[PDB]
Structures are given as structure tokens and as C-alpha cells.
Design a binder for this molecule. Sequence first.
Ligand SMILES: CCCCCCCCOCCOCCOCCOCCO
Ligand SMILES: CCCCCCCCOCCOCCOCCOCCO
Ligand SMILES: [Cl-]
Ligand SMILES: [Cl-]
Ligand SMILES: [Cl-]
Ligand SMILES: [Cl-]
Ligand SMILES: [Cl-]
Ligand SMILES: [Cl-]
Ligand SMILES: [Cl-]
Ligand SMILES: [Cl-]
Ligand SMILES: [Cl-]
Ligand SMILES: [Cl-]
Lengths: 231, 234
Amino acid sequence: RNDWHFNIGAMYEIENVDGLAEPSVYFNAANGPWRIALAYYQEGPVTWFDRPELEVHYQFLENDDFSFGLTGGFRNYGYHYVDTANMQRWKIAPDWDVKLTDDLRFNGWLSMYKFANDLADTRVETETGLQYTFNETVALRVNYYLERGFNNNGEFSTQEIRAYLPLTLGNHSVTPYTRIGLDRAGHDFNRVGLFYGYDFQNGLSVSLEYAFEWQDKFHYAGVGVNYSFHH
Amino acid sequence: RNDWHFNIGAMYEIENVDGLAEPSVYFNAANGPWRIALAYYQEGPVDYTWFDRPELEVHYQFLENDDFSFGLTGGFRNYGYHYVDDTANMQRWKIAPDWDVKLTDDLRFNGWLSMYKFANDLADTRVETETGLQYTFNETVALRVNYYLERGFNNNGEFSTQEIRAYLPLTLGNHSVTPYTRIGLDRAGHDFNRVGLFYGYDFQNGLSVSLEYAFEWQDKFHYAGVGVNYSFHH
Ligand SMILES: CCCCCCCCOCCOCCOCCOCCO
Ligand SMILES: CCCCCCCCOCCOCCOCCOCCO
Ligand SMILES: [Cl-]
Ligand SMILES: [Cl-]
Ligand SMILES: [Cl-]
Ligand SMILES: [Cl-]
Ligand SMILES: [Cl-]
Ligand SMILES: [Cl-]
Ligand SMILES: [Cl-]
Ligand SMILES: [Cl-]
Ligand SMILES: [Cl-]
Ligand SMILES: [Cl-]
């Protein structure tokens, strides 16, 4: 009688200006607070690599006024080229949502990455901000986003302000979003894009995302399917 | 040739106004970033209902360097309770980020956040955090002002503890002296206060002693404790 969530799904993504094809298969299960995610991803020209990924999530607390949980995960980048060099990534993320006002909400995730051999390299990636909620269907989100590599050798900073406007009307999800990359070591850059999604009400859903980015034109386009069965 | 830190130590603590005796044994080892801590603690009424804490703890220090440093602890503790009017147990899982960040040559923004989840008998999420600023005068002297919060979450329920804490760590020769005060702001809004002195000594051979005296009030409270720690490396 014990309630499980079994999701399985896959995504195809391509980024062009030729390009990168990105097959993605994933599935995950959930019991009460606990959740487990396995995923396999691969990157190649249509030199390549693949991502085995395991992830666990414990949701400590979920209630209106405050909610938070913690993700761990392991990923492996097998690189194959034109010899098999591998790189591992350990990820610990706190993720939270906090109630300020009926509209206002302070939430976000913080991610602590540690990279294994071949290729120290600590990394912090964070997206945290405010969600204003207009009504059931519409909400605005402005986040601060930062990725930092730490400490020849070394790494640098990425800073962006992101804005999404999630729109849920009937079976459709529409989420326009922009990323304004701030200086972040240098000059301005920009991503804009639309995230469409659809739900057939039966556990099947589709995800279509288009994005343009520039500094240097960039075209991202991707699709996905997900099936949700419970128990 | 591989560098380990083996520490072992114990502490005796008593809190009175009768009172609570608190035997504590602990030891831990460290390799590069990684560290492991085991500890056993016990709480009971002396003479001139109790419980005991088995505790395991792991710490990964991701980054240590002047300008920025951080790491993450996890740990498991078990409170065996034994009583008078049957052995009921309670488990506690702890995930703490801990950080230190460089603002200025003097100023430093650091602290730890702790996420507790409690197991059966007796949900109960808990957040405990101490975060603040460290001003550094010189090698020997530094001031620390932190914000401290403990929160239990969501008959049934829990409440808030809020405090501002101040320590003045003083390292002169072999001696550590750390006066500290805790001004408890909130519970339901009554005021309360702890004051205390933390003495410590190092014999330079790996042995060290820790003597701490504290008074607290709202309701007088007397805490006194001692400890020894031995550090051998490799
Ligand atoms: C887990 C037990 C921790 C130790 C218990 C403390 C109570 C009495 O122990 C006193 C230990 O004193 C001996 C210190 O070690 C010898 C000194 O080492 C210096 C030689 O280089
Ligand atoms: C609470 C447990 C904390 C520590 C207990 C585990 C002790 C294991 O330590 C073993 C130390 O190192 C193992 C072998 O040492 C390296 C030998 O080879 C190096 C020379 O090439
Ligand atoms: Cl987000
Ligand atoms: Cl509406
Ligand atoms: Cl937008
Ligand atoms: Cl998106
Ligand atoms: Cl202790
Ligand atoms: Cl404790
Ligand atoms: Cl602290
Ligand atoms: Cl003081
Ligand atoms: Cl002490
Ligand atoms: Cl104490």
C-alpha cells in the first residue's frame, strides 16, 4: 500500500551555431521524502563523452511556510577521442524554498562539486532568488546564478541574473526565460528561450525547449518525454 | 609516508544549580581533506533517568585557502534513554555545511549550518546555525560575533531559540583563553544569558587540557568542564 513514484523519460538535445547531439535517458523512484535518480547522457558531434549519473535526494521538510532538502550525486564523464580518460563529479546540493509573503518566496539551490582524477577542482554552482506569485497559473522568478571554480592551474567565475515566467494554463506549461550573464571574468552575454511542455493527463508528458544565446550566436533546441506512474 | 591525524581525548562535564555528570570519550582520524570522528557521551544525575550518545561523524573539507574555505560534515547519533518510571531510542542525522570567507584582512565571514532529522520513538526536522563575523586584531587576538538559531519544525510542534554570541579568542604562549557570552534573544520572547571563560593549555607534546567555566541565568545555571586531548600524527 506504500506510495512510490516511478518516473522514466528521455530527452534529445542539440546545440548548433555541425553541432552537438545529446541523447538522454533517465528514470527515478520516490518513497515519502526519499528519492533516487539514475540518468545516462552523451555528448557528440552529429571527440565525445557520456555521463553516467546517480542521484539521491532527501527532502527533510515540505510545508507552505518553509521547505528544504538535500541532494547528493555522483557523475562520471567518460571521454573518448580522436584512449578513455575519465573524470568523476561529486555533488552535494542544499535546496530550499522559504515563505516571506503570500506572493513573495525566497528559494534556490546551492551545489558543491568535487572532481575526481584525470580530466582537486572544487566547484560551487548556485541559483537563488525570489518568486513572486500572481495567481495559480502565473509566477515570476528572478534568481542570482553563480558558478565558481577554485584556486599553472585555476578556474574563473560565471555570474548571471536569470528570469523565468512560469505559466501554467490548462495542460500546457510555458516558461519564457532569460539569462543575462554579467561580467563573469569579462564582457556581457545573453541567453533567451522558451520552454514549452504538455501533459496528456495519463502520466505522459512532452517538453519542447528552444533557446538562442549570444556574446557568437548559439542555438539550443531540445525535446523530451516523461512517464509518471505511481503505484 | 601518508599523513594521518589521530586525536583521542575525553571530557568530564557537570551542570548544576544535584546536577548532571557527563563523561565523554572521543577519537578521530584525518587524511588530507577527509576526517572521521567517533564519540561516546552519557548524561545522568550524580552524587557528589539517563541517556548515552553513540556518535559517528565524517567531514569532507572541500576547500581550504586564505580567501575562501569550506567543508561539509555528516553524522549519526543515537540517544539511548534509560529510565526510572525500558530502553527507548532516538536517532539523529546531521548534515552541516561549514564555511569561512575572506572579506578583508581583518574581517572574516564564517559559520556552520546544521540540518537535523530525528528517527523513531523518543519527523522532527531541526536547523541549528551559528554564523557571524570574525575580526582579527593580530596573531594572538580575535573577536567573534555570531548569530545563533535553533529551530524545530511544524498536538505536536517545536519552537525557536535565538542568540547573539561573542567570543574573544586569545592565544598567548601555550595558553588559550576564550571569554564568551551568549545573549539569548528569543524563545517566546523572554531574555536569557550565558557568560563563561574557556581556558586551555598545550604541553607541546600532543597533550592538551581544556577547562571551561560558565554561568547562565534567566534560574541560575552553573556549567563546569574539563578535557584532555592527545594528538599524534604519523
Ligand atoms: C580516550 C582516553 C583519553 C585519555 C584519558 C584522559 C584521562 C587520564 O589520562 C591522562 C593521560 O596522560 C598521558 C598523556 O600521554 C603521555 C604524554 O605524552 C607526552 C610524551 O611525548
Ligand atoms: C575511527 C577510525 C579512524 C582511523 C582508523 C583506521 C586506521 C587505518 O589507518 C591505516 C593507516 O595507513 C594504512 C597503511 O599505511 C600506508 C602504508 O603504505 C604507505 C607506504 O607506501
Ligand atoms: Cl530556479
Ligand atoms: Cl488562474
Ligand atoms: Cl524572460
Ligand atoms: Cl528551463
Ligand atoms: Cl562534546
Ligand atoms: Cl550536540
Ligand atoms: Cl562558528
Ligand atoms: Cl565576552
Ligand atoms: Cl570544555
Ligand atoms: Cl557547553
